[PDB]
Write a protein that binds this ligand. Structure first.
Ligand SMILES: CC(C)(COP(=O)(O)OP(=O)(O)OC[C@H]1O[C@@H](n2cnc3c(N)ncnc32)[C@H](O)[C@@H]1OP(=O)(O)O)[C@@H](O)C(=O)NCCC(=O)NCCSC(=O)CC(=O)O
Ligand SMILES: CC(C)(COP(=O)(O)OP(=O)(O)OC[C@H]1O[C@@H](n2cnc3c(N)ncnc32)[C@H](O)[C@@H]1OP(=O)(O)O)[C@@H](O)C(=O)NCCC(=O)NCCSC(=O)CC(=O)O
Ligand SMILES: CC(C)(COP(=O)(O)OP(=O)(O)OC[C@H]1O[C@@H](n2cnc3c(N)ncnc32)[C@H](O)[C@@H]1OP(=O)(O)O)[C@@H](O)C(=O)NCCC(=O)NCCSC(=O)CC(=O)O
Ligand SMILES: CC(C)(COP(=O)(O)OP(=O)(O)OC[C@H]1O[C@@H](n2cnc3c(N)ncnc32)[C@H](O)[C@@H]1OP(=O)(O)O)[C@@H](O)C(=O)NCCC(=O)NCCSC(=O)CC(=O)O
Ligand SMILES: CC(C)(COP(=O)(O)OP(=O)(O)OC[C@H]1O[C@@H](n2cnc3c(N)ncnc32)[C@H](O)[C@@H]1OP(=O)(O)O)[C@@H](O)C(=O)NCCC(=O)NCCSC(=O)CC(=O)O
Ligand SMILES: CC(C)(COP(=O)(O)OP(=O)(O)OC[C@H]1O[C@@H](n2cnc3c(N)ncnc32)[C@H](O)[C@@H]1OP(=O)(O)O)[C@@H](O)C(=O)NCCC(=O)NCCSC(=O)CC(=O)O
Ligand SMILES: CC(C)(COP(=O)(O)OP(=O)(O)OC[C@H]1O[C@@H](n2cnc3c(N)ncnc32)[C@H](O)[C@@H]1OP(=O)(O)O)[C@@H](O)C(=O)NCCC(=O)NCCSC(=O)CC(=O)O
Ligand SMILES: CC(C)(COP(=O)(O)OP(=O)(O)OC[C@H]1O[C@@H](n2cnc3c(N)ncnc32)[C@H](O)[C@@H]1OP(=O)(O)O)[C@@H](O)C(=O)NCCC(=O)NCCSC(=O)CC(=O)O
Lengths: 164, 163, 161, 164, 162, 162, 162, 162
């Protein structure tokens, strides 16, 4: 029924409603990324410097995008994207990415970086990510986790068009 | 009439100021029909952006919106405009001249901008060139990219008074 | 006896203070042509950190280093194990703990100048003379040193847990 | 008489003695660098990001080196350099350069960069400066003030030598 | 070049801290039979002070000492001059500055334990093997050292020492 | 199990208070010819401290002591390890920790009045019947229990004890 | 008669102050050849305390004393019971209560200068002319009157005195 | 008009400062073998006090002294009466006033060093060469003077000295 989008995180205080949403997001990420260790997912989701765009359907977490903004560096690292299995192929992934794009325009961070594996690179291509990295290697080598084996990809946002 | 220059911006600490940015957003938007109004308003009212307001008789008639990147050593030129009935009188040059002198006093000596085919001439007349000495590694991801426009650069001489 | 590893630096505690002195002692005694005052300046410099190796409350070796996150590498400044405790794998455990620490912090490159007395130790830790970090990335950040050989180690990234 | 070296500047929080020394230094820089507009020297010498090493003899400023530390880039820019004409060719300029080196040794900065006229290049050569610039252009362009026409020069410090 | 004397100690700024390291280095190198860790613990102990001898910004000697005002004496803990600066009067100059310092703080007795290689230096600074301070006043306060000689210096507060 | 050491005493929270009660029971049970009220008074006395030995949250032994920093020594008052944890080195690790703690406070002499069942243990810890501390520094600060042997341990501050 | 024991001293309450006047009166009447001004100075001295014997609200005797914790003893300054209440055990109960009170303050030695009229009473309270406290601990702290006998009492912290 | 005031530089108004300078002047002129900078340091020391003798607002004499209440005695530091007020009993009145002062502060011993030119003044004030205060209580607290004679005065607290 009712769909909500919210950008949340564990600030250095957390609504009980927020704390349960964060557990829900860790649950979803963990289940949809089974070889990603759950303790690692938990630490990023609950890290103050990370934020997560929660997708709420009838008060229940059904998807998210966890990310770390690097405003000093001019980009944001996408850490986890996931929709729960029985809600996939319904466009939720696309509305999530769009909402994330809207959120970043309004904070003048205009570049996404992410590692895309073989299971989801096709989704990132359809959201405009390419393998041509325009951000200088020196801007991100020390900041994003290197998921060697997976393909580094980049999205450039246009701050002049509406995404939501 | 009387002509005054003032550097203003949306602080985090006025009404004469606020009304002037509204006017500048108005003029910027009318002279730049391809820049969406909301995008102009978002940048013009962003606190890290400043605008060199040109004013004739209490009325905003021109401005240069800009964004100082002092950690990077350059200022980004964001918007330039002179209201239509006041063009070809030298206001565009006095605004650039004033923006130059102001940047000498804050020891920022490089301007970067993107120019479409219709504005490249104006910037060339203000001393901008297509040859970019500032490295990509310093500006990409900090200045707004504009694919399909030409990146232009101006170098300032601090031993020279511009105004 | 008991073995501890601790990454420490000047802010601190009295415990950390006396460890930094022990490290400055170990570095200075094993590198006697370094000026004593220069080692102390770096060990107590707050953008340097030192990995300390402790045996029964005692400094018996360490590695002092400078991280450059904006450049994706870390400079290794001093490595020393006290004489009585050398040739026991302690140098290897130090470098292994240093490697783990840097993988957790997303820095996958070590740069260091090695001399003729210790280049082989660095070789056995996977360092080589082939420098893949661009010169434009480390020039002016690491203390260049004519008469010594710049070496590089590349680490493999790892997902924690 | 008595000689004193002091690293001084217009900082966050002023001293009456420091202020007058700063006026004195701006006077000496202007009188010895005529091509530099006196008002340009003034705003640099009083800029908080700039420091000046003052050479004091008998309470009176007779020389100085104005410099801008760029620690995130690894070098220091030497901005002005002057000894009052009455005190030149007595080794004061060397002593000044030596103290500035020692000061930078203790602050773990080991490169100097400066633009020198044909008139002054000899003095910097004798302080160990070289036309061979080993810092990449990407590291200093837009940070040091360009003087097109003058020669860019670099001095490398050894943190193991006692310069004072 | 420029000689300077400073009484310092832990309690804390970078210059003092690097000086304390410098004193620890000089003590430890000139007293090889003293554990480096022990020297470091006492030099950096807040009830311990050190009179540091500064030549052109570098530490070239000092005297680490422990004032016992309730007991009426100071314990000399370490004295050293760096090898290349010795036999130039620096050791005598350090002790004189230490005596002058203690006059103004109204402590007029020094106590130290000297091994056979150090007795001569203390004798020439006016120390004696005749101990006037009673055992009940110093035992358990100063660190005793079996095998070394306890020596004592009495100061004249009516005399300019420096 | 998990073994901890805590220096505690009265001045306050309940875990400490139950530890102090356990110490009182252990001391009292191991030393039954000593009035229980007297042990309790001393353990809860604010000028007294106890080094507690904890095994799985429970008190299995300790050393109750009285620091006299003005007199330059500490008095060992009670030493006890519970009966089933004896002859395993806990009594020695307790004394060792107590030694390390006193070196940090520049108290280098322990004194104790040992009975005939305890002298062997104190000798193993380096105590001796040769008292170097003069009578005038300890008489009346510690009670001379008739028939008990005065014993002294001197601590070496250059050495690690734990 | 309702008997009470209170340890009191100056530096305030109305009842305490009238008790102190009453103690100055009893001490002075029972010791007529000691100047009443000197008794008052001591009784009201803030470093002096008095253990007061109270019968039906009225002061009928007491012991004025000076605790010297730094020196590890207490000086007995005056003892008196009013004449109508002598030879009924009051002086013994006072001294017993004084002993208990010093036991819980870790002071185990009393020193006093008895005159010829009071040596018998002090002997019955366990005082001896054999002084174990060394002279250096008490001389100049307690007042030595020519013609008085220094006597000493050693307390046992394991004995219940009251 | 004669006046007696106990004064000191206790961490002083203008009147007290000029009296202290007056006393430094008088002591300096009457004890010319004391360095005038030494007299100044002691007279102005916050732990020292001086009993001033004032005549028509003017300083004509005094006794500078240092109270050691921890040690149970006081050190007589300087004694002087200006030359044209001498042999009038002013110096006796001063010592008596100082005695009265010390009884009300429960200090009963004076210690001082006297050369031959001064021993007879102190003998007339009740000082003896037989020292009862033990060496462990004064050595390193009072200022030694080799070649002078250590003298002692025992005061009696039941005697009004003024
Ligand atoms: C990838 C998803 C989050 C996408 O969410 P949705 O299923 O709601 O997608 P959507 O409905 O909005 O579809 C948008 C378009 O992408 C296409 N598409 C192509 N490949 C796809 C793929 N592998 N997964 C999902 N969609 C894919 C769809 O056909 C559709 O095409 P069209 O519109 O033309 O019809 C989900 O599949 C998921 O949770 N997967 C498991 C988790 C995962 O792999 N996450 C990324 C890991 S890599 C990474 O960076 C780590 C991380 O983020 O977790
Ligand atoms: C460009 C202007 C700001 C210049 O204003 P003025 O007319 O007051 O300037 P001026 O009178 O000093 O003209 C100086 C000289 O410039 C020369 N000239 C040549 N080409 C020109 C050009 N395209 N625009 C303006 N002047 C131009 C003219 O010959 C003129 O006369 P002579 O040569 O004889 O001396 C204005 O014309 C204007 O508002 N234009 C529309 C808005 C715009 O295009 N802004 C720039 C892009 S925004 C931007 O900054 C980048 C971005 O956001 O992407
Ligand atoms: C270099 C050391 C820290 C190494 O410590 P250890 O002795 O504990 O090494 P280790 O026991 O773990 O030995 C691991 C492997 O290295 C091999 N090996 C080869 N050459 C070696 C050499 N020159 N020194 C030490 N080990 C060496 C050993 O045979 C062994 O091989 P295998 O196990 O396969 O049989 C120590 O030797 C030392 O403190 N030396 C003096 C200080 C010094 O020279 N420092 C480096 C300065 S240059 C520099 O870059 C700055 C700095 O580091 O200070
Ligand atoms: C350059 C000076 C600061 C040097 O000071 P001193 O006169 O005290 O020099 P000194 O006594 O220490 O001697 C240094 C040695 O260098 C040699 N030498 C060679 N060329 C020289 C030159 N142009 N000026 C001074 N010395 C020079 C001299 O022979 C000398 O002796 P020997 O040969 O025997 O060893 C001063 O001369 C001066 O203030 N000049 C005017 C201002 C100026 O030009 N400043 C520098 C430019 S500032 C600049 O352009 C860079 C910047 O902007 O920061
Ligand atoms: C002893 C020193 C501090 C003295 O320093 P200096 O050499 O500068 O002294 P100086 O130049 O003033 O010498 C003054 C005179 O003393 C005489 N002299 C006698 N013995 C001497 C000795 N062992 N070393 C130096 N001088 C000595 C010399 O004849 C000399 O010349 P003349 O007679 O002609 O005038 C130094 O030599 C040193 O650092 N030694 C190693 C450390 C040490 O032994 N420290 C003392 C123990 S530490 C301590 O305090 C106790 C403890 O650790 O328990
Ligand atoms: C005394 C103890 C605290 C010792 O504790 P531990 O049993 O844990 O001792 P440990 O295992 O660490 O050390 C054992 C070593 O000491 C030697 N040893 C010799 N005589 C001993 C003796 N009477 N008790 C214990 N050990 C003794 C053993 O041969 C052995 O030799 P090796 O060297 O080969 O290993 C305990 O036995 C105990 O609680 N006893 C009853 C209480 C008591 O008597 N306390 C002291 C009272 S007098 C006092 O001043 C304190 C007090 O009042 O309680
Ligand atoms: C000394 C006193 C405080 C004792 O007080 P009490 O009268 O209450 O004594 P008490 O009843 O408890 O007696 C305890 C035992 O001490 C024995 N005894 C021996 N000589 C005594 C003596 N000189 N004075 C009092 N009792 C004395 C008695 O026989 C007595 O009985 P038995 O032996 O049978 O049990 C008091 O007598 C008094 O105030 N005296 C005047 C002041 C004085 O002298 N103060 C001390 C000065 S220095
Ligand atoms: C000593 C004085 C303070 C005494 O003062 P007055 O003159 O007022 O003495 P007075 O009138 O009260 O008593 C005089 C009586 O003392 C006797 N008498 C014996 N020897 C004397 C002596 N050496 N000095 C003064 N009086 C002396 C006389 O016979 C006379 O006898 P009769 O009794 O029958 O009347 C003064 O003389 C003085 O200022 N002297 C110079 C300073 C000085 O020497 N101060 C003492 C040392 S300072 C110190 O404290 C020592 C140190 O620190 O080393």
């Amino acid at each position: 029924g009712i769909i909500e989008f919210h950008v949340i995180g564990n600030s250095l205080k957390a609504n009980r409603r927020v704390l349960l949403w964060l557990v829900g997001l860790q649950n979803v990420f963990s289940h949809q990324l089974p070889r990603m260790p759950k303790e690692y997912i938990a630490r990023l989701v609950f890290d103050p410097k990370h934020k997560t765009l929660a997708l709420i359907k009838d008060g229940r977490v059904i998807g998210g995008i966890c990310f770390r903004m690097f405003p000093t560096q001019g980009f944001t690292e996408i850490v986890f994207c996931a929709v729960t299995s029985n809600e996939q192929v319904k466009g939720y992934g696309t509305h999530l990415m769009n909402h994330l794009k809207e959120y970043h325009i309004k904070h003048n961070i205009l570049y996404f970086l992410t590692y895309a594996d073989e299971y989801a690179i096709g989704y990132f291509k359809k959201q405009g990510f390419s393998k041509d990295i325009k951000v200088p290697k020196s801007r991100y080598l020390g900041y994003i986790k290197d998921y060697e084996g997976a393909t580094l990809m980049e999205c450039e946002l246009n701050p002049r068009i509406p995404y939501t």
